[PDB]
């Protein structure tokens, strides 16, 4: 369930 930060997606 990816989440996005400053343009990039990633887990947790």
């Amino acid at each position, epitope marked *: 369930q*990816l989440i*996005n*930060t*400053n*343009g*990039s*997606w*990633h*887990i947790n």
Partner: antibody
Amino acid sequence: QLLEQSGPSLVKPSQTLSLTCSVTGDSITSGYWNWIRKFPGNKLEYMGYISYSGSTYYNLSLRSRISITRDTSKNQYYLQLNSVTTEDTATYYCALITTTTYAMDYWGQGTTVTVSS
Amino acid sequence: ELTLTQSPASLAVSLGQRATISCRASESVDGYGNSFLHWFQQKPGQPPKLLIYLASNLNSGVPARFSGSGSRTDFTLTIDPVEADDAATYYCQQNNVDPWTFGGGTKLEIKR
């Protein structure tokens, strides 16, 4: 599920463009809430989002003069763009990204905005 | 910085034939086993409409004539067979590398 758009269709140069997106269906405390704009022929430019948590992400070209805010009780979010010029004349779409697709899957009909005196 | 390049700018395809549109990224848009590249269709007076999400997944309510393929930097949308209703502009979009961008568009014209 409906993203309704509101706002002025005419703005004077060097002034501030304020747009509103009212969401009916699910809460904006879920997903990512974006603004995109389409230039007079016919390029698309991503503007940015406010997340479910209230964190914002902006396109670096617009970081200088853009502000995306929200109101969870009214279930709306808004776009503010300052020092506007004739190059900001476009159609302004609001759109949602869910985690079902991780893409912009729901859109609003758009707000045609002309910058003029 | 990152650029998506669509080809061609305009494509003319006959009814019932196959159409192929390409999108090329200068850097990878992959991440966590997924390619963060999506395909939209836009007609005049309307918002863009999601056709393909994550490179190769068909959005619900979109016909099976549409398909997406590719990875990393090289991606392709395919319409087979193409129908009259498919006259529009097609865009690719990536949302994993700052700054987020769209391709310049590919107009599809039906030959008749």
